[PDB]
Design a protein around this ligand. Structure first.
Ligand code: CHL
Ligand code: CLA
Ligand code: CLA
Ligand code: CLA
Ligand code: CLA
Ligand code: CLA
Ligand code: CLA
Ligand code: CLA
Ligand code: CLA
Ligand SMILES: CC(/C=C/C=C(C)/C=C/[C@@]12O[C@]1(C)C[C@@H](O)CC2(C)C)=C\C=C\C=C(C)\C=C\C=C(C)\C=C\[C@@]12O[C@]1(C)C[C@@H](O)CC2(C)C
Lengths: 211, 42, 158, 68, 197
């Protein structure tokens, strides 16, 4: 736990501006950007931090699942066609069965996680053979060799706050990427790589303003 | 922030949202069961 | 056939009403393109009222001498899909609401100035009090058993 | 040493008077004037305001019940 | 004890003295002790008769579909023709039950009152524990210990659940639940609540 208070250690998102006082910069990925001041009170602050982390991780997974199969279609062996139209793809089972199974299992898991949030340490999975003392928690970073078997979130590979900063920044970027992909498919009728190459060929004209 | 929460807990806005939700439920039921005169379940 | 009211699964004036309604609807329908979305919705409402007439001709609805449904609330559960079951359902709902409101008020009575929580509801307490509706028949029951539902000679003040 | 009449303090009282808004009502004593020339020496606050906007008035002891 | 929510604290209503405690009251019904007793007795009786009923549903069905026996479905047994007409056995049931259950209720209101068979004075009864009657009910001298009451209540709760399942599945289908199981084993994905709507 390292703090990033005002000064050179605090590169303000808006140069020449004093960041909101209740934005200390402890949470990695902070730059003093909350003009709406939603993080005014601490309970809301931590709640929004958890929401941000979850959104970032899910958005990373979603953008990977969009990107990789489409390029492996374009040039790779197997041809995974339009992902936006894969939502209605036909499988062995009906979409509602898939939906209810997803909801059951994810409700189980996310409910256990919800109780962990409301009551830290009271719902954890970390066995204890004798004489080896286990690690604690920092909710949002469960620890133990279930979700950190590489021993990366604790020390050695990088000071923690730096790696969490990497994570939150990449997650914000991935959120932008997902909303961009979706909005493009709303407007255009291709995948992300197709729009990409179309822009590469004609950067000067092949844009949103092409029509 | 908490001020806007206590403000949102003031009866006008709470009542408006509650009534909107109830009316939406009723109109959706009517959509999924047109003219619904009797109780043809038992 | 209560007092001679035949069900309009068999009466005729019902068929006449249905015929005239669908007829005026169809005559209105032939003033647009056969594919225009308004004409499409018109045909949709046509088939909708048709299947309504059909549904009414499926649930023993005794039917007037002028071609109109007519409820039979005399108590005979033969025609109960009109009053008895919807009646007890609405009674359940009303008891739900009454009990939850009463319990909320009885709870919040114990504060400094309960008016401040009567104008601005304790939405947290409201949320953890509200779903108790499933208890309203039984709970109040025990209350009356234990006499903790009414009062005897405390009238004003509290 | 002369025994002061009226309840001591904080004693919730039940009103016996008929022609007040709080007939059969539960109030709280706030003081009693020890002067034996008074004619209504106790005074009671309530949690329910009456029509005139007032929330306090006077009584004798006969119109009180020292409930608890 | 086993709070069914690894993070929630159990309310003071269900300490753990009574068997099967898990703090499973998210609506605070039995927070009054006498009503807690009432619902204890109600759960006991409902679970016992639900076990009875679910046995009487399942076992006949499989023994008939096995070819060893022949007996109609539990729902198809009403219209069946017996040595006795319906109303006769029904009124006999009514009188016998209005005796037994009213004695049970009198025991509930008064612990240890109606003990003896009021016909003969010996042979009567050893004093009991409410909800767990005495000699003439447990002939095999089973010790009423823990892990017996807990197993009873758990089996009875699951039996209640299974009975409600039987009833609603007969409602939606009208078929034998074991046939539903066979169709299920054929293809659990092609055979579920989804397709039948
Ligand atoms: C309380 C539980 C209970 C359940 C689930 C049933 C089940 C049923 N009984 Mg029933 N019975 C029950 C109590 C009793 N029955 C009977 C004796 C009969 C007879 C003689 C008949 C039924 C019939 C019926 C059916 C009524 C039609 C219907 O469900 O409309 C929705 C239904 C399958 C009828 C039937 O089997 O038709 C299919 C029928 O003829 N039952 C007795 C002894 C008198 C009961 C005592 O509790
Ligand atoms: C002992 C409990 C029990 C068991 C073993 C079953 C078993 C079955 N039910 Mg069923 N059911 C139950 C209770 C149960 N039900 C209850 C309480 C209800 C009322 C809400 C229903 C309502 C119901 C309907 C409406 C239908 C089934 C159907 C079915 C069959 C296909 C499964 C399916 O569609 O999902 C079952 C659907 C449910 C809504 C069941 C929910 C049960 C709850 C969640 C408790 C069960 C949890 C339990 C611990 C997990 C299963 C235990 C098992 C592995 C031993 C299957 C044989 C279908 C069928 O017959 O088609 C083949 C069907 O159409 N059930
Ligand atoms: C839904 C996704 C989501 C959520 C919950 C958050 C949540 C948060 N962000 Mg954030 N952010 C996101 C997406 C998200 N972000 C994306 C996609 C970007 C890239 C444009 C950013 C860029 C960003 C910056 C630059 C900063 C934050 C900050 C914050 C924190 C201040 C409180 C706040 O803004 O209210 C919660 C948000 C809402 C209620 C949305 C309305 C909070 C933990 C500030 C902070 O303290 O850093 C940690 C800050 O300086 N965010
Ligand atoms: C973010 C969540 C997410 C979601 C909802 C989906 C959804 C889907 N993926 Mg998928 N995917 C994702 C992320 C996601 N992907 C990521 C991050 C990757 C790694 C790049 C993949 C790699 C991937 C492959 C390689 C395939 C899918 C396929 C599919 C489809 C059927 C699933 C199947 O049969 O595979 C079952 C596979 C399991 C491992 C189980 C479905 C539309 C399949 C498809 O397009 O249909 C044939 C398929 O072959 N996905
Ligand atoms: C990208 C980056 C740079 C990180 C970085 C980190 N993650 Mg992380 N994570 C990501 C994506 C990323 N994650 C995604 C997409 C998921 C969803 C599958 C997760 C799920 C996740 C868990 C569940 C955990 C981490 C943990 C960690 C830390 C080791 C480090 C801060 C661990 C940690 O810090 O715990 C001590 C940890 O427990 N992350
Ligand atoms: C990571 C952000 C990102 C990137 C790299 C792209 C890239 C692209 N978009 Mg795009 N887009 C984005 C976000 C992004 N978008 C978002 C958030 C939306 C929702 C409003 C859209 C909506 C959108 C539509 C509707 C269309 C494109 C299209 C395109 C392609 C042609 C460029 C163009 O005309 O659009 C320019 C894109 C915008 C004006 C969107 C503005 C939003 C982004 C975030 C601008 C900010 C820049 C970014 C933060 C700085 C770089 C970060 C990083 C890449 C280094 C190009 C590959 C077109 C296409 O399909 O190609 C043929 C097209 O028709 N975009
Ligand atoms: C004194 C007025 C009165 C009351 C209290 C009830 C009350 C009831 N009637 Mg009833 N009924 C009434 C007048 C009344 N009805 C009149 C005027 C008629 C027509 C002559 C009927 C004909 C009637 C029938 C035919 C049946 C009832 C039935 C019932 C019961 C269901 C319910 C308790 C039903 C019943 O007995 O229980 C199923 C039933 O089958 N009622
Ligand atoms: C849950 C609260 C509640 C309960 C249990 C009752 C109960 C009763 N009221 Mg009543 N009442 C209420 C609220 C309530 N009232 C409110 C808010 C008003 C003002 C609009 C009235 C106005 C009123 C009049 C004018 C009369 C009664 C009468 C009666 C009695 C007969 C039933 C009747 O005629 O009601 C008829 C039904 C109504 C009047 C509808 C009012 C019910 C409201 C809409 C429910 C309020 C719920 C709450 C505010 C919402 C918050 C929900 C929760 C999350 C907190 C009965 C004791 C009658 C009586 O004296 O009988 C002897 C009578 O003449 N009430
Ligand atoms: C008629 C059936 C019935 C009754 C009387 C009870 C009664 C009781 N159960 Mg119980 N239980 C039941 C069915 C029943 N249960 C079933 C079917 C299950 C499995 C899903 C359970 C699972 C269960 C657990 C896990 C626990 C209890 C506990 C308790 C006790 C305290 C909770 C309470 O006040 O419940 C009172 C219940 C009612 C008044 C029922 C009201 C009717 C509701 C609305 C029915 C719900 C909808 C219905 C399906 C239609 C109480 C003695 C707790 C306890 O203290 O153990 C000792 C506990 O830990 N039960
Ligand atoms: C499911 C059930 C009750 C379930 C109640 C539950 C879960 C309540 C849960 C909660 O309260 C708690 C715990 C805590 C609260 O904060 C939350 C809620 C959720 C409110 C009772 C079923 C109870 C079911 C019972 C008692 C069934 C008995 C069946 C019998 C006797 C069968 C008889 C037959 O089968 C034979 C014998 C012969 C056949 O031929 C004919 C017939 C007649 C059909």
């Amino acid at each position: 736990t390292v703090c990033e208070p005002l000064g050179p250690d605090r590169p303000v998102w808006f140069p020449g501006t004093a960041p909101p006082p209740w934005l200390d910069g402890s949470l990695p990925g902070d730059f003093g950007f909350d003009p709406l001041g939603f993080g005014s009170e601490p309970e809301s602050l931590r709640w929004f931090a958890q929401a941000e982390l979850m959104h970032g991780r899910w958005a990373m997974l979603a953008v990977a699942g969009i990107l990789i199969p489409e390029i492996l279609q374009k040039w790779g062996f197997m041809e995974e066609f339009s992902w936006y139209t894969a939502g209605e793809r036909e499988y062995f089972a009906d979409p509602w069965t898939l939906f209810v199974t997803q909801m059951a299992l994810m409700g189980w898991v996310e409910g256990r996680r919800w109780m962990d949030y409301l009551n830290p340490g009271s719902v954890d999975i970390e066995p204890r053979f004798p004489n080896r003392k286990n690690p604690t928690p920092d909710v949002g970073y469960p620890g133990g060799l279930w979700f950190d078997w590489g021993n990366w979130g604790r020390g050695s590979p990088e000071p923690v706050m730096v790696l969490r900063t990497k994570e939150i920044k990449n997650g914000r970027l991935a959120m932008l990427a997902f909303v961009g992909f979706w909005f493009q498919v709303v407007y255009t009728g291709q995948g992300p790589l197709d729009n990409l190459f179309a822009h590469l060929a004609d950067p000067g004209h092949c844009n949103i303003f092409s029509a | 922030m908490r001020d806007i929460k206590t403000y949102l807990s003031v009866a006008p806005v709470l009542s408006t949202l509650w009534f909107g939700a109830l009316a939406g439920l009723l109109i959706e039921i009517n959509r999924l069961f047109p003219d619904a005169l009797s109780f043809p379940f038992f | 056939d209560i007092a001679g009211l035949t069900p309009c699964k068999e009466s005729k004036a019902f068929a006449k009403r249905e015929k005239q309604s669908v007829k005026k609807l169809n005559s209105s329908l032939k003033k647009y393109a056969p594919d225009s979305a308004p004409a499409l919705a018109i045909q949709a409402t046509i088939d909708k009222t048709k299947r309504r007439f059909e549904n009414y001709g499926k649930f023993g609805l005794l039917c007037g001498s002028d071609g109109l449904p007519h409820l039979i609330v005399s108590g005979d559960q033969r025609h109960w899909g009109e009053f008895i079951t919807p009646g007890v359902l609405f009674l359940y709902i009303a008891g739900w609401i009454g009990w939850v409101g009463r319990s909320y008020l009885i709870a919040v009575s114990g504060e400094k100035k309960p008016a401040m929580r009567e104008i601005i509801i304790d939405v947290e307490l409201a949320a953890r009090i509200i779903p108790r509706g499933f208890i309203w028949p039984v709970a109040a029951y025990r209350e009356l058993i234990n006499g903790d539902l009414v009062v005897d000679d405390a009238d004003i003040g509290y | 040493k002369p025994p002061p009449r009226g309840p001591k303090r904080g004693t919730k009282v039940k009103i016996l008077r008929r022609e007040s808004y709080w007939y059969n009502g539960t109030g709280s004593v706030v003081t009693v004037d020890q002067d034996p020339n008074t004619r209504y020496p106790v005074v009671v606050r309530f949690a329910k305001v009456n029509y005139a906007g007032v929330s306090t008035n006077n009584y004798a002891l006969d119109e009180i019940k020292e409930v608890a | 004890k086993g709070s069914w929510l690894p993070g929630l604290q159990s309310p003071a209503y269900l300490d753990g003295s009574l068997a099967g405690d898990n703090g499973f009251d998210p609506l605070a019904l039995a927070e009054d002790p006498e009503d807690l007793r009432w619902f204890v007795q109600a759960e006991l009786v409902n679970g016992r008769w639900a076990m009875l009923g679910v046995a009487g549903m399942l076992i006949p069905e499989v023994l008939t579909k096995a070819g060893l026996l022949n007996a109609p479905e539990w729902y198809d047994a009403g219209k069946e023709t017996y040595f006795a007409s319906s109303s006769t056995l029904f009124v006999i049931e009514f009188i016998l039950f209005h005796y037994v259950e009213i004695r049970r209720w009198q025991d509930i209101k008064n612990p240890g009152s109606v003990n003896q068979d009021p016909i003969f004075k010996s042979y009567s009864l050893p004093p009991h524990e409410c909800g767990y009657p005495g000699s003439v009910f447990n002939p095999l001298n089973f010790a009423p210990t823990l892990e017996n009451k807990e197993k009873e209540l758990a089996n009875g709760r699951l039996a209640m659940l299974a009975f409600l399942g039987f009833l609603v599945q007969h409602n939606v289908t009208g078929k034998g639940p074991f046939e539903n199981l066979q169709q299920h084993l054929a293809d659990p994905w092609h055979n579920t609540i989804i397709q039948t709507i």
